[PDB]
Design a protein around this ligand. Structure first.
Ligand SMILES: O=C(/C=C/c1ccc(O)c(O)c1)O[C@H](Cc1ccc(O)c(O)c1)C(=O)O
Lengths: 168, 168
């Protein structure tokens, strides 16, 4: 199940995203060749654990930019849903303005390609993938729904892969 | 692809391990039902990223014991190779005495079952799996060969799954 394999090219995708400026744009994983990419899935918009994760990554996007690394979040919700959540203030339980793009995967094909579809519910597990500047998958993380991810740990991994990339 | 699926029983195994007392014993994942298990693969013995991880999990095994959690390491090397590394003095790059068992997977079937065999080389990637006290797989972590895992992160995940098990 899925085509995400360590040491092999990460599965490409082309999807509509809500961009940091608040507007829609169709983006592809291949747009970010030359940069490391952290690509993470969350189950659903308008939930309780996912916003804490999304906001944590968005708040700390600058730490990833200094590592020449693009962060991209994704769920199976529509792109309109993403925009409604961004336009809901954080004070009121929304995401607020974002520093990272949020991809919409409404046909669930990206989640299936990455092997993180919870088939009996049509939603993704908490999958996170680290892809190097050549597009090669370097790291797979999948959490069951109840437990969120750590930005600290993700930064540690990105830094460590970049460090070992310099060896010869 | 393997048979390790979030929310499903983690694949059972029965394999020879070198135990903390330095003796060989055949153990099974099902021996630890009723406790959380952290089951991690490392690629080969007598290497220079794996020992940092193994020694860290061994050194801090009491923190997992406080969480009622058993840590188990594994590689495709023979159990004789495992013990030779344990018996190598730490000052010469050895593991030293271990607080955790080290499973031998010489047929590569356990790595295949867990979807972490690097097929063109016959060794495992750095897979780590968190399995709950009912035997259900809760978390999947797979790193490419160059980059090690974090005990802190593993403890964070084990504790968080146990907390959400009780309330949520
Ligand atoms: O000993 C090492 C060191 C890996 C490493 C350490 C630093 C680097 O910058 C880098 O590119 C690779 O890895 C081995 C795993 C391994 C086994 C076989 C290989 O052909 C391999 O490339 C790595 C281990 O720790 O078990």
């Amino acid at each position: 199940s899925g085509n995400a394999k360590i040491g092999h090219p990460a599965p490409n995708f082309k999807a509509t995203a809500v961009m940091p400026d608040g507007q829609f744009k169709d983006i592809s994983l291949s747009d970010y060749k030359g940069k490391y990419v952290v690509f993470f899935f969350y189950p659903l918009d308008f939930t309780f654990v996912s916003p804490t994760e999304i906001i944590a990554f968005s708040d700390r996007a600058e730490e990833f930019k200094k590592l020449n690394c693009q962060v991209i979040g994704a769920s199976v919700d529509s792109h309109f849903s993403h925009l409604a959540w961004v336009n809901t203030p954080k004070k009121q339980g929304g995401l607020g303005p974002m520093n990272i793009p949020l991809v919409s995967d409404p046909k669930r094909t990206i989640a299936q390609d990455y092997g993180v579809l919870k088939a009996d519910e049509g939603i993704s597990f908490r999958g996170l993938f680290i892809i190097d500047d050549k597009g090669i998958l370097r790291q797979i993380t999948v959490n069951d729904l109840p437990v969120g991810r750590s930005v600290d740990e993700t930064l540690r991994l990105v830094q460590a892969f970049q460090f070992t990339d310099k060896h010869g």
